[PDB]
């Protein structure tokens, strides 16, 4: 079939900026390309159709063009309501295909994460399990990496991570990393480290604790 490519999963902009999301077919779509918008709440709406250009009931700031393989959507003046995920869609050949989507986000001044680590709770230890959690909150841009070190080394297994969409008051992101072991394994070692690597600085921000010290 026809593969639709949208270079840029996430795209940054300020409110009031001309924004452009690209989309490129794996072949000549003969100008049969559509564009859908999808709000965070999940709903989907049609914006433009037929190689872009053709509107629906949508605001004037939305514009579109393209031809053959290369197409694009442009929002002359970005509005808060505009913040969402945009998918393009070729209606030239079956099966109908969709691009990867591009999700706008706002431009914040780089931040550097606030890192906190938390040993396991007695309550959970009694259950025989043990989980060490670590929060990397309010940071920007969204790209980040969290590294767990037990007794000063490796550790990949037992690590589970969660991320949040951009905040709506400040435009930061946050992340929750969780390493779960067995009570026994947790007692066979001493220092647990949560290292955070963020462009915000070349030296990882390190937080950890020693059991013998608790």
């Amino acid at each position: 079939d026809i593969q639709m490519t949208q270079t840029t999963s996430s795209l940054s902009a300020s409110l009031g900026d001309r924004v452009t999301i690209s989309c490129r077919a794996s072949q000549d779509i003969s100008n049969y390309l559509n564009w859908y918008q999808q709000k965070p709440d999940g709903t989907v709406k049609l914006l433009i159709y037929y190689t872009s250009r053709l509107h629906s009931g949508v605001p004037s700031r939305f514009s579109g063009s393209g031809s053959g393989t290369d197409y694009s959507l442009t929002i002359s003046n970005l509005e808060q309501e505009d913040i969402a995920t945009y998918f393009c869609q070729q209606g030239n050949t079956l099966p109908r295909t969709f691009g990867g989507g591009t999700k706008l986000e706002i431009k914040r001044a780089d931040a550097a994460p606030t890192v906190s680590i938390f040993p396991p709770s007695s309550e959970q230890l009694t259950s025989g399990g043990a989980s060490v959690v670590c929060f990397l909150n309010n940071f920007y841009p969204k790209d980040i990496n969290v590294k767990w070190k037990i007794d000063g080394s490796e550790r990949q297994n037992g690590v589970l991570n969660s991320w949040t969409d951009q905040d709506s008051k400040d435009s930061t992101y946050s992340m929750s990393s969780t390493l779960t072991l067995t009570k026994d394994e947790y007692e066979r070692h001493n220092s647990y480290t949560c290292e955070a690597t963020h462009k915000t600085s070349t030296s990882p921000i390190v937080k950890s604790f020693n059991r013998n010290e608790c």
Binding site: G42, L54, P95, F98, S116, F118, S162, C214
Partner: protein, 218 residues
């Protein structure tokens, strides 16, 4: 107004099946095709297939054919989709949208709110709230771990909501066939452990409400 109300979310065991609804309104049901898209967290929409209510002519996307069957009721102007012998990769959100004409080639001008299909076999199970406290400067972050529950959702709050700003409740993750999530709150050092900081975790499905107090030391 053109309206498409899809069925509620469905929780069903793998191997089984399920038929979801999509009910059109504000326009002539048989004059416009219906298509179904599939969306998994892992971005992108997948074009399931398209059915013409007037004739019942379906057209499937090879990758869904066989396990999927598109039907309709040209009476209650309602469109249906059936997914058989479910796998986990069936877990997702399904949209039905009306397809339309200009310049030779259709497009979807109206979508539904989508239905959420979750394929699991765990059962209504309460979570275990675990307090997250620093061990034995100006601002202090505390937490609360909600592990081993099912199915979503679970509602978290701090001090019955009196602590709103500076809170972060992370999306859940499937641990061992169950769900687990965390939640943080950043309050000044004067507040805790001075005063009380408590997480309020509610898990509806199991009719469970929990208030765990974050106390000093491990």
């Amino acid at each position: 107004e053109v309206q498409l109300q899809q069925s509620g979310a469905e929780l069903v065991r793998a191997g089984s099946s399920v038929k979801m609804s999509c009910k059109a309104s504000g326009y002539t049901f048989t004059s416009y095709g219906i298509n179904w898209v599939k969306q998994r967290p892992g971005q992108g929409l997948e074009w399931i297939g398209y059915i013409n209510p007037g004739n019942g002519y379906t057209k499937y996307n090879e990758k869904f054919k066989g396990k999927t069957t598109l039907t309709v009721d040209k009476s209650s102007s309602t469109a249906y989709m059936q997914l058989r012998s479910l796998t986990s990769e069936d877990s997702a959100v399904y949209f039905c949208a009306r397809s339309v004409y200009y310049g030779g080639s259709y497009y979807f001008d109206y979508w539904g709110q989508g239905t959420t299909l979750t394929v699991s076999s765990a059962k209504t199970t309460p979570p275990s709230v675990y307090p997250l406290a620093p061990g034995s400067n100006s601002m202090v972050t505390l937490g609360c771990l909600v592990k081993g529950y099912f199915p979503e959702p679970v509602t978290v709050t701090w001090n019955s909501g009196s602590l709103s700003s500076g809170v972060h409740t992370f999306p859940a993750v499937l641990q061992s066939d169950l769900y687990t999530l965390s939640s943080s709150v950043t309050v000044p050092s004067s507040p805790r452990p001075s005063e009380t900081v408590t997480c309020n975790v509610a898990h509806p499905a199991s009719s469970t409400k929990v208030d765990k107090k974050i106390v000093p030391r491990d």
